[PDB]
């Protein structure tokens, strides 16, 4: 089996994007963020407290004729953002472009923390990490892919997400006609849960490339490239003006500036990101102060390839018994 379904960006900044995906019978349509850092499906639902759904749409499992509540399990997760959530367990069937899983774990939110519940175009979270890192007590839940992972015509899943445009996730094939050149192939730790890999290096705008390795984690939830502070510094160096500012929580830049593109590596291959894909936009309604989309790990105690970086490619995250990643221009 295969399915498709497109990725849409929730808002002018691309700073999530959403899939929608059919959970129940008959089916209740939510719209959930694809995220590659996390291992757990959870939804806002008719139990979660009233006070804090502020738009969303919600998973009723009292009106799925396939929904079953999974007796004595409950949940709850906090982000590397900050954000929370937590409750119960249902198992239903869930399709995410026409493949289908019966008996998925869906994490029924009781409570959400309150970024969740401002932003009203996000229904839950639908995790593509390994399931090792699943919140569910007292029996650990699989995600979705791995649910779908043997029926699928080959174990692997893609992303390609669109720059201030609509995307694709791919479930279980390879769409050749989606990037250019040739897919390189790197490996995977799967030691901390996460698609971790090291990148062989870095440019900034037209410079010299410098070979050094780099390990971090592709993931789709996190809207920004965080890298170490080393790296950063020379990026924003190039940028007239740009200076971190503690109080903003990053660095910041002229809004008049024009940006350089950062290349990452790939083994040999070299991801190229568009300037203008690193620019985040006023920190603050009408302000002329603009946000950066590559920022410092420093205390983050990892790397992030987030969307500013996925987004320039075509990536593969192939779950095969040893699993790796893929990475090609498009």
Not at 103 to 131: H, N, P, R, Y
């Amino acid at each position: 089996s295969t399915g498709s379904a497109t990725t849409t960006p929730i808002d002018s900044l691309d700073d999530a994007y959403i899939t929608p995906v059919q959970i129940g019978t008959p089916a209740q349509t939510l719209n959930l963020d694809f995220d590659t850092g996390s291992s757990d499906l959870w939804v806002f639902s008719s139990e979660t407290t009233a006070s804090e759904v502020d738009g969303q749409t919600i998973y009723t499992p009292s009106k799925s004729t396939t929904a079953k509540l999974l007796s004595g399990a409950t949940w709850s997760i906090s982000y590397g953002d900050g954000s929370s959530s937590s409750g119960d367990v249902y198992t239903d069937t869930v399709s995410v472009g026409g493949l289908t899983v019966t008996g998925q774990a869906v994490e029924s939110a009781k409570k959400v923390s309150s970024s969740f519940t401002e932003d009203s175009t996000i229904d839950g979270l639908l995790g593509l990490a390994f399931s090792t890192l699943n919140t569910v007590s007292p029996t650990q839940q699989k995600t979705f892919f791995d649910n779908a992972k043997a029926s699928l015509d080959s174990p692997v899943f893609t992303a390609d997400l669109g720059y201030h445009a609509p995307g694709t996730y791919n479930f279980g094939f390879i769409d050749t006609t989606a990037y250019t050149g040739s897919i390189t192939y790197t490996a995977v730790s799967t030691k901390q849960g996460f698609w971790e890999w090291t990148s062989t290096g870095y440019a900034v705008g037209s410079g010299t490339f410098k070979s050094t390795s780099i390990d971090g984690i592709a993931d789709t939830g996190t809207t920004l490239l965080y890298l170490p502070a080393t790296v950063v510094s020379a990026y924003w160096a190039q940028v007239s003006g740009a200076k971190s500012s503690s109080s903003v929580g990053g660095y910041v830049f002229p809004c008049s500036a024009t940006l350089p593109s950062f290349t990452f590596g790939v083994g040999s291959a070299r991801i190229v990101i568009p300037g203008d894909y690193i620019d985040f936009g006023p920190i603050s309604t009408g302000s002329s102060s603009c946000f950066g989309g590559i920022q410092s790990s420093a205390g983050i105690g990892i790397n992030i390839f987030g969307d500013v970086a996925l987004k320039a490619a075509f990536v593969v995250f192939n779950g095969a018994t040893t699993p790796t990643l893929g990475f090609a221009s498009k």
